[PDB]
């Protein structure tokens, strides 16, 4: 559970926003890509795993689950690649609420940025610092340090 | 000291590798860019500060220190922007040694990757996981969790 992440893909302005959620904290990383391909997904996971100790990734759809390029990055980075079936239906609801919250923040910042990728990084920043009380950024560090100790 | 980072710029294969070092742990993030500009620097810092609690950044040279774009990102993200003068001459030597270590790792992985940007992320992953026995990934989480508590 300190090591479990969920991928999530959402669309805006004709482009794709790929998000990884650390399940136990609500903390996120995200990027803007022109389209979701196994190569883009695999590179994003390699970046994520070099920065946090990623043990398991629930993929966002069957295409990235199937993709041999995604599986080769997970092999390289020591990640267990799993499906994203919401056996717990609460997962579905949490992800959709998170997407709407991100789109809301992106909309509140959109006119401060020329490029969508700046607005998305502004939205990552505000989401991870938001105190709900601790922030998601605080929670992920606490959860992982507790587990290292 | 949990909030202090140092930027560092090194070159390889005709391109630029921008690195942020978390000073107290040795942990790093890095990206490949075609040239170091104020806009590329500012975007890299906005990404970094959405992911870790960045209080201070020592810029890597006087052009990024000067750059009004870099200053605007530091303002947006709540980062105190500082110069990079090594009043402690040990700073120069630690950085030069880290660049030579990264380039050595990049050369050991270089033929597993078509693009330099993959070889660089593979070197970030190996640097941050390497046990010296704690890794730099372990040390940054512990330092920051201690400070949160």
């Amino acid at each position: 559970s300190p090591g479990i992440w969920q991928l999530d893909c959402t669309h805006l302005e004709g482009k794709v926003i790929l998000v990884a959620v650390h399940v136990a904290s609500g903390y996120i990383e995200a990027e803007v890509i022109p389209a979701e391909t196994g190569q883009e997904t695999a590179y994003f996971l390699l970046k994520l795993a070099g920065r946090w100790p990623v043990k398991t990734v629930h993929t966002d759809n069957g295409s990235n689950f199937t993709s041999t390029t995604v599986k080769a990055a997970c092999w390289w980075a020591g990640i267990k690649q799993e499906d994203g079936i919401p056996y717990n239906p609460q997962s579905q609801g949490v992800i959709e609420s998170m997407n709407k919250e991100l789109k809301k923040i992106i909309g509140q910042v959109r006119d401060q940025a020329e490029h969508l990728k700046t607005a998305v990084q502004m939205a990552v920043f505000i989401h991870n610092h938001k105190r709900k009380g601790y922030s998601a950024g605080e929670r992920i560090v606490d959860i992982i340090a507790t587990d290292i100790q | 000291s949990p909030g202090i980072w140092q930027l560092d710029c090194t070159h390889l294969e005709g391109k630029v590798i921008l690195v942020a070092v978390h000073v107290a742990s040795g942990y790093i993030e890095a990206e490949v860019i075609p040239a170091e500009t104020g806009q590329e620097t500012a975007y890299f810092l906005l990404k970094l500060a959405g992911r870790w609690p960045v209080k201070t950044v020592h810029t890597d040279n006087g052009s990024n220190f000067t750059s009004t774009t870099v200053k605007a990102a530091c303002w947006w993200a709540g980062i105190k922007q500082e110069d990079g003068i090594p009043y402690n001459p040990q700073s120069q030597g630690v950085i030069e040694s880290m660049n030579k270590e990264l380039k050595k790792i990049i050369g050991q992985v270089r033929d597993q990757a078509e693009h330099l940007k993959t070889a660089v992320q593979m070197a970030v992953f190996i640097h941050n996981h390497k046990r010296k026995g704690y890794s730099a990934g372990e040390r940054i989480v512990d330092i920051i969790a201690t400070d949160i508590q």
Partner: peptide
């Protein structure tokens, strides 16, 4: 090509 990022 037998690269992680280009398996072809």
């Amino acid at each position: 090509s037998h690269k992680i990022d280009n398996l072809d």
